Design an enzyme around this catalytic site. Structure first.
Site, PDB file in Angstrom:
ATOM      1  N   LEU A  43       0.807  -1.213   0.000  1.00  0.00           N
ATOM      2  CA  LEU A  43       0.000   0.000   0.000  1.00  0.00           C
ATOM      3  C   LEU A  43       0.842   1.266   0.000  1.00  0.00           C
ATOM      4  CD1 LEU A  43      -2.676  -1.148   2.595  1.00  0.00           C
ATOM      5  CD2 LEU A  43      -2.859  -1.151   0.108  1.00  0.00           C
ATOM      6  N   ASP A  64       5.642  14.870  11.467  1.00  0.00           N
ATOM      7  CA  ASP A  64       5.742  14.366  10.094  1.00  0.00           C
ATOM      8  C   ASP A  64       4.357  14.482   9.457  1.00  0.00           C
ATOM      9  OD1 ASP A  64       6.672  13.347   7.747  1.00  0.00           O
ATOM     10  OD2 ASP A  64       7.165  11.356   8.527  1.00  0.00           O
TER      11      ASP A  64
HETATM   12  N1  LIG Z   1      -7.989   1.682  -3.761  1.00  0.00           N
HETATM   13  C1  LIG Z   1      -7.373   1.539  -2.583  1.00  0.00           C
HETATM   14  N2  LIG Z   1      -7.985   0.813  -1.623  1.00  0.00           N
HETATM   15  C2  LIG Z   1      -7.375   0.665  -0.444  1.00  0.00           C
HETATM   16  N3  LIG Z   1      -6.195   1.149  -0.048  1.00  0.00           N
HETATM   17  C3  LIG Z   1      -5.610   1.862  -1.015  1.00  0.00           C
HETATM   18  C4  LIG Z   1      -6.117   2.102  -2.283  1.00  0.00           C
HETATM   19  N4  LIG Z   1      -5.243   2.881  -3.025  1.00  0.00           N
HETATM   20  C5  LIG Z   1      -4.244   3.092  -2.204  1.00  0.00           C
HETATM   21  N5  LIG Z   1      -4.394   2.509  -0.972  1.00  0.00           N
HETATM   22  C6  LIG Z   1      -3.423   2.589   0.121  1.00  0.00           C
HETATM   23  O1  LIG Z   1      -3.882   1.831   1.223  1.00  0.00           O
HETATM   24  C7  LIG Z   1      -3.496   2.473   2.459  1.00  0.00           C
HETATM   25  C8  LIG Z   1      -4.724   2.728   3.298  1.00  0.00           C
HETATM   26  O2  LIG Z   1      -4.371   3.553   4.429  1.00  0.00           O
HETATM   27  P1  LIG Z   1      -3.842   2.922   5.777  1.00  0.00           P
HETATM   28  O3  LIG Z   1      -4.856   3.007   6.848  1.00  0.00           O
HETATM   29  O4  LIG Z   1      -3.346   1.508   5.501  1.00  0.00           O
HETATM   30  O5  LIG Z   1      -2.562   3.798   6.113  1.00  0.00           O
HETATM   31  P2  LIG Z   1      -1.063   3.527   6.570  1.00  0.00           P
HETATM   32  O6  LIG Z   1      -0.599   2.211   6.102  1.00  0.00           O
HETATM   33  O7  LIG Z   1      -0.996   3.751   8.079  1.00  0.00           O
HETATM   34  O8  LIG Z   1      -0.279   4.720   5.869  1.00  0.00           O
HETATM   35  P3  LIG Z   1       1.213   5.129   5.461  1.00  0.00           P
HETATM   36  O9  LIG Z   1       1.585   4.154   4.339  1.00  0.00           O
HETATM   37  O10 LIG Z   1       1.273   6.561   5.052  1.00  0.00           O
HETATM   38  O11 LIG Z   1       2.053   4.810   6.701  1.00  0.00           O
HETATM   39  C9  LIG Z   1      -2.698   3.715   2.068  1.00  0.00           C
HETATM   40  O12 LIG Z   1      -1.300   3.450   2.104  1.00  0.00           O
HETATM   41  C10 LIG Z   1      -3.188   4.003   0.648  1.00  0.00           C
HETATM   42  O13 LIG Z   1      -2.198   4.659  -0.135  1.00  0.00           O
END
Ligand SMILES: Nc1ncnc2c1ncn2[C@@H]1O[C@H](COP(=O)(O)OP(=O)(O)OP(=O)(O)O)[C@@H](O)[C@H]1O
Lengths: 133, 385, 406
Positions: A23, A132
Site C-alpha cells: 500500500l 511528520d
Molecule cells: N484503492 C485503494 N484501496 C485501499 N487502499 C488503497 C487504495 N489505493 C491506495 N491505498 C493505500 O492503502 C493504504 C490505506 O491507508 P492505511 O490506513 O493503511 O494507512 P497507513 O498504512 O498507516 O499509511 P502510510 O503508508 O502513510 O504509513 C494507504 O497506504 C493508501 O495509499
C-alpha cells in the site's frame, strides 16, 4: 501493559507479504493489505534493524488516543512485531493530488483541511507532537 | 415499499432448501477459511445416523448413512501438524465415530460411552481438547493428539452429575481471550472448569426466587453464552436468565413473550430453541416459533423481531465462508400444512445465511427513512407557503 | 401366521388409515383396537416405533378428549409402545399434558385411571426426570383426588398400591416434595398434608409465600391443617405473624390452636400470653387452652400414616433392589383497654375458680369488673400496674382468698 482488545490472533490473520499487496512505505516499516477477522485491513510490518521502541512509539498514540481524525488500530502483535489498522477506502492524499486532480472540489479541500486540523489539535492537546505531516 | 423497508431483505445473503423430508439436528462448518467453504449436517429423520455434506458454492447435497443411531452433535478438529483435518460424530447409542474431512475411507470408532453423547465441543487452552459430554452428566475429557488412534480412551472422565441430569451445554468465553474457564451446564446446574480440570463453581439453578416463572425455570439448561455475565435458556422456556458470574445470583429475567406480544396481536409456545451471542453488538435469540430476536446487548433494548421465514429455528451458529466472515448460519424447519392438519411429515429444513452486521443496518435504515420523511415534510411545507 | 401378517405391511396400512382420516371416530376406535391387538405380537415394537405410531396416538387423544373408549384405549396403548427415544434427553411434555388432562377429565372412571397410572408408572420406569414434568402440569390434582377417593370409596389394594408406587417415584426429589406440599397446603386437603409431612417436606420453605402457617391461615383453612403445620417444625416468628393475621381475620379455632403452641406450658400448667400484642381478649380465643380432660385424643385419620408407610416401603424397596388445672394466666404486654369479655359467663367461667394468680400489668385497663373479681374464688396473686386506673375499686378485697395485691 496495554488493553487486552488489541492482541493479535494469528489464526484470524490472512496476511501475504508481496509487492503486489503493498500500500505504501512508512517511517520504519512497510504496509500491506490483508484480512483480519473477515475484513479488509492493513498490516504494518517493521524492518529487520528495528526494536520494540518503535512499536511502542506507534502504540503511545495508536492505543491511548481515539478520534475521528486519527487512524484506528485493530490489533498489535509481538511475535512478528506488526500493527493492524484500518484501511482507507480512497487511499492516500498523494494519489489524489497526482493522479485524480479532478474530484478536488473546494468543499472536499475544506473538509480535508478541517479534519487534519482537528486531528492536530487533538494530538497537541494530548501532550503529543507529530513532526511528520 | 414496506417489504423493501426491511433489514431482513438486505442482510439475508443466501437461502438453501434441503431435500424433501429431512430432519437435520446439528450442523458444523468446514472452516479453514481457505480450504473449502461447506457444511456438515447430522440428519435425524431416521433412526440410523446419516452424515451429509453441503458444498456451499454449488449447493451440492451428498448424504451418507454411517451411524446405527441418530447423530446428536458434530465437531471439527484441525491439527496444524501435517495439515490434518478430521470430524468427530456423536451418536445416540453412545459411540463416537471419527472420519477424515478430506479422506472418505478413514472411519474408526472410539470408546463407547455409557449413554448418548450430547456435546462434542472442541477448543484449545496451547493444548487442544475435544470435550465429550455424555447424556449422564459426565464430561469425558479427550485428547486431540489421540484422535489418530483407532479406538482410544478419554484422558480424564470428569463426573458432574447423575444419569438423571444430562450434560448438554458446553461453551467457552470470548471476552479478553479468557480461554481458561469454559462454563458448561449439567442438568439444571451450571459448572465451570479450567486446564486444572477442577470445578471452580457448581451453581444450582432449578430454584426461582420469584417462584412464579419457576415452571419455565425448572428445566434442563440447553445453551449458555457469556460475554460479561451468564445467559441461560431452558427447554420450553419463554424466559432467558441473565445471571451474575461473581455474585452467582439472577441479575435479570428477559421475557421473550413480552417482546413477541407486539407482533403476535397484529398458551404462547415462544420457546428458546437456540441462542447465539455476537461479539460486542447484540444478542441473537432463536425461538421455536420461527421468530428471531435481535436484542441490544447494552442493557435491554429489542433491536428487531424477524419472522415469516421459518416455522421453528433449530440451530444458530457463527461461521466464516470464503474469506467473507460475519455470516450467522440459521437452520429452520419450514413445515407446510399442505400434507395435513395432523402435523403430517412435510418439513423443509431451510439453511439460510445471514450477515451478523444485521443489528447495525436496522438503525442505519431507520435513520435513512426518518431523514427522508423529514425531507418530504419540509418540501410539502415549502409547497404550501 | 403373525410374521406373515406383519410382512404384509399391516401396521403401515392401519396407521395410514387412522392418521390420514382424523374424522369419523368409529374408524379411530377400530384403529386403536387393531393396534392394541398388534402390539403384543412378537415383532410389533420395532416396526411400530419406526412408523411413528406414537405421534398418531397422541394426536388421536388430542382431537378426542371427551370420548371414553378412545381415551381408555390410548392410555392403555401409550405405556405399551413407549420407548426411550420418545422421552429422549428428558423431553416429554405433550405426554405429561395429555396424561394429566385425560386423568383429570375422567376422575371417577376406574378403568381409565388404572390404565393411565399403569402407563405413567411404565414411563417413570424409563426416565425419572418425567416426574418433574408431571408435577409441572398439575398432576397433583389427579394424585390427591385419587388417593382420597380410593380410601373413601371401594377399596382396591392393587389400585392403591399402584397409586402409592407412582407417588413414591414422583416424590424422589426434595424440591418436588416441597412443591407438592405447598400446593396441597393451598387447597383444603388436610387428609394428606400429614402424610407429606411424614415423608418430609419441611414446613419452613419461604419463597414469596412467606410463612406457610400464615398463608394457609389467610385462605380460610381448616383447623386440622393448621394443627399439622404447628405440630411439625415451624419457626416462632412465623407463628406469631400467623397469630397477628388470624387476629385480623377473627376466627376462634385457629387463634386458639396458635396460642396452644405460642403460649402454654402444660408441664408447669401455666399460660405465658405475654408480649403477643393482641388488642383484645375473648373467652373463645383462650377457651380450649384449659386442659379439659373429659375430651380425649382421637386417632381416626390413620389413612395418612398408612399411605406414608406404604410410600416409604416402596421407596426403600426401589433403593435396595437397584385435676391439673392450668393456673398461671398471664396477660401483661397486651394492649388491653378493657377485659369485659371475661366477665360474661362462658367456658372460661367453668375454670376460673382455681386461677391462683393473674398478671395484668403494663396495659390500659380501667375499672376492673365486679363480676370477674366475684368469679375468681382462689386468686392469690393479682398484680396490675402501669394501667390507666383513676380510683381504687375497693371491691377487689371482697374476693375469697387474695394475697399480694399490687
Ligand atoms: N484503492 C485503494 N484501496 C485501499 N487502499 C488503497 C487504495 N489505493 C491506495 N491505498 C493505500 O492503502 C493504504 C490505506 O491507508 P492505511 O490506513 O493503511 O494507512 P497507513 O498504512 O498507516 O499509511 P502510510 O503508508 O502513510 O504509513 C494507504 O497506504 C493508501 O495509499
Amino acid at each position: 501493559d496495554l488493553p487486552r482488545n488489541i492482541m493479535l490472533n494469528n489464526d484470524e490473520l490472512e496476511f501475504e507479504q508481496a509487492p503486489e499487496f503493498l500500500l505504501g512505505d512508512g517511517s520504519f516499516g512497510s504496509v500491506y493489505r490483508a484480512a483480519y477477522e473477515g475484513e479488509e485491513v492493513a498490516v504494518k510490518i517493521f524492518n529487520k534493524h528495528t526494536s520494540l521502541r518503535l512499536l511502542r512509539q506507534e502504540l503511545v498514540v495508536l492505543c491511548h488516543l481515539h478520534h475521528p481524525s486519527l487512524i484506528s488500530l485493530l490489533a498489535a502483535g509481538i511475535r512478528p512485531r506488526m500493527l493492524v489498522m484500518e484501511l482507507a477506502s480512497k487511499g492516500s492524499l498523494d494519489r489524489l493530488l497526482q493522479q485524480d486532480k479532478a474530484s478536488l472540489t473546494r468543499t472536499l479541500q475544506h473538509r480535508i483541511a478541517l479534519h487534519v486540523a482537528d486531528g492536530l489539535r487533538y494530538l497537541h492537546s494530548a501532550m503529543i507532537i507529530y513532526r511528520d505531516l | 415499499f414496506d417489504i423493501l423497508n426491511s433489514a431482513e431483505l438486505v442482510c439475508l445473503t443466501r437461502r438453501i432448501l434441503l431435500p424433501k423430508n429431512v430432519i437435520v439436528e446439528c450442523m458444523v462448518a468446514t472452516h479453514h477459511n481457505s480450504r473449502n467453504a461447506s457444511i456438515w449436517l447430522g440428519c435425524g429423520h431416521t433412526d440410523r445416523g446419516q452424515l451429509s455434506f453441503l458444498d456451499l458454492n454449488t449447493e451440492g447435497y451428498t448424504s451418507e448413512e454411517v451411524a446405527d443411531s441418530r447423530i446428536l452433535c458434530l465437531a471439527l478438529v484441525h491439527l496444524p501438524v501435517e495439515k490434518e483435518s478430521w470430524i468427530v460424530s456423536g451418536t445416540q447409542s453412545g459411540t463416537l465415530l471419527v472420519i477424515n474431512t478430506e479422506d472418505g475411507k478413514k472411519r474408526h470408532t472410539l470408546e463407547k460411552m455409557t449413554d448418548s453423547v450430547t456435546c462434542l465441543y472442541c477448543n484449545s487452552f496451547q493444548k487442544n481438547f475435544l470435550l465429550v459430554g455424555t447424556a449422564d452428566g459426565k464430561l469425558a475429557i479427550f485428547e486431540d493428539k489421540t484422535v489418530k488412534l483407532k479406538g482410544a480412551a478419554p484422558l480424564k472422565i470428569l463426573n458432574i452429575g447423575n444419569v438423571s441430569t444430562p450434560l448438554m451445554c458446553l461453551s467457552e468465553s470470548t471476552n479478553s481471550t479468557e480461554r481458561n474457564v469454559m462454563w458448561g451446564g449439567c442438568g439444571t446446574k451450571i459448572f465451570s472448569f479450567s486446564n486444572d480440570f477442577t470445578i471452580q463453581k457448581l451453581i444450582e439453578t432449578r430454584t426461582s426466587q420469584l417462584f412464579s416463572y419457576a415452571a419455565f425455570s425448572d428445566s434442563n439448561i440447553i445453551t449458555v453464552v457469556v460475554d460479561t455475565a451468564l445467559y441461560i435458556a431452558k427447554q420450553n422456556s419463554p424466559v432467558v436468565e441473565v445471571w451474575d458470574k461473581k455474585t452467582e445470583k439472577l441479575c435479570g429475567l428477559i421475557d421473550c413473550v413480552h417482546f413477541l406480544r407486539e407482533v403476535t396481536v397484529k398458551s404462547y409456545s415462544g420457546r428458546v430453541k437456540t441462542l447465539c451471542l455476537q461479539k460486542n453488538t447484540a444478542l441473537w435469540i432463536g425461538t421455536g416459533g420461527g421468530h428471531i430476536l435481535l436484542l441490544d446487548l447494552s442493557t435491554r433494548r429489542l433491536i428487531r423481531v424477524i419472522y415469516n421465514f421459518c416455522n421453528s429455528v433449530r440451530v444458530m451458529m457463527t461461521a466464516q465462508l470464503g474469506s467473507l466472515k460475519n455470516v450467522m448460519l440459521v437452520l429452520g424447519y419450514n413445515r407446510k400444512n399442505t400434507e395435513g392438519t395432523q402435523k403430517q411429515k412435510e418439513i423443509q429444513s431451510c439453511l439460510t445465511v445471514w450477515d451478523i452486521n444485521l443489528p447495525h443496518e436496522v438503525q442505519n435504515l431507520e435513520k435513512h427513512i426518518e431523514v427522508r420523511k423529514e425531507l418530504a415534510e419540509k418540501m410539502r411545507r415549502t409547497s404550501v407557503e | 401366521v403373525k410374521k406373515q401378517c406383519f410382512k404384509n405391511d399391516i401396521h403401515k396400512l392401519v396407521l395410514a388409515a387412522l392418521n390420514r382420516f382424523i374424522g369419523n371416530p368409529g374408524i379411530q376406535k377400530c384403529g386403536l383396537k387393531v393396534i392394541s391387538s398388534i402390539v403384543h405380537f412378537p415383532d410389533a415394537l420395532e416396526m411400530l416405533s419406526l412408523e411413528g405410531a406414537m405421534d398418531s396416538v397422541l394426536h388421536t387423544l388430542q382431537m378426542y378428549p371427551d370420548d371414553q373408549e378412545i381415551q381408555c384405549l390410548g392410555l392403555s396403548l401409550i405405556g405399551y409402545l413407549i420407548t426411550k427415544k420418545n422421552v429422549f434427553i428428558g423431553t416429554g411434555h405433550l405426554l405429561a399434558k395429555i396424561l394429566v388432562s385425560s386423568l383429570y377429565r375422567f376422575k371417577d372412571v376406574a378403568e381409565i385411571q388404572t390404565k393411565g397410572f399403569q402407563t405413567i408408572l411404565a414411563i417413570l420406569k424409563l426416565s425419572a426426570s418425567f416426574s418433574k414434568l408431571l408435577v409441572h402440569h398439575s398432576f397433583d390434582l389427579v394424585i390427591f383426588h385419587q388417593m382420597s377417593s380410593n380410601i373413601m370409596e371401594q377399596k382396591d389394594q392393587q389400585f392403591l398400591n399402584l397409586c402409592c408406587k407412582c407417588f413414591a417415584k414422583v416424590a424422589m426429589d426434595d424440591y418436588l416434595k416441597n412443591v407438592m406440599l405447598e400446593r396441597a397446603c393451598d387447597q383444603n386437603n388436610s387428609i394428606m398434608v400429614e402424610c407429606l409431612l411424614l415423608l418430609g417436606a419441611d414446613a419452613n420453605q419461604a419463597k414469596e409465600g412467606s410463612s406457610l402457617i400464615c398463608q394457609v391461615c389467610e385462605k380460610e383453612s381448616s383447623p386440622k391443617l393448621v394443627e399439622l403445620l404447628l405440630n411439625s417444625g415451624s419457626r416462632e416468628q412465623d407463628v406469631r405473624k400467623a397469630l397477628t393475621i388470624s387476629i385480623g381475620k377473627g376466627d376462634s379455632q385457629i387463634i386458639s390452636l396458635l396460642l396452644r403452641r405460642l403460649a402454654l406450658d402444660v408441664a408447669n400448667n401455666s399460660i405465658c400470653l405475654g408480649g403477643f400484642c393482641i388488642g383484645k381478649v375473648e373467652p373463645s380465643w383462650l377457651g380450649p387452652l384449659f386442659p379439659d380432660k373429659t375430651s380425649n385424643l382421637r386417632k381416626q385419620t390413620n389413612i395418612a400414616s398408612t399411605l406414608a408407610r406404604m410410600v416409604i416401603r416402596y421407596q426403600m424397596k426401589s433403593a435396595v433392589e437397584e385435676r391439673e388445672y392450668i393456673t398461671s394466666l398471664d396477660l401483661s404486654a397486651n394492649e388491653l383497654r378493657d377485659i369485659d369479655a371475661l366477665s360474661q359467663k362462658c367456658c372460661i367461667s367453668v375454670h376460673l375458680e382455681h386461677l391462683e394468680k393473674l398478671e395484668l400489668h403494663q396495659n390500659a385497663l380501667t375499672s376492673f369488673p365486679q363480676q370477674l373479681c366475684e368469679t375468681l374464688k382462689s386468686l392469690t396473686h393479682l398484680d396490675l400496674h402501669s394501667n390507666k386506673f383513676t380510683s381504687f375499686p375497693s371491691y377487689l378485697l371482697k374476693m375469697s382468698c387474695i394475697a399480694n395485691l399490687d
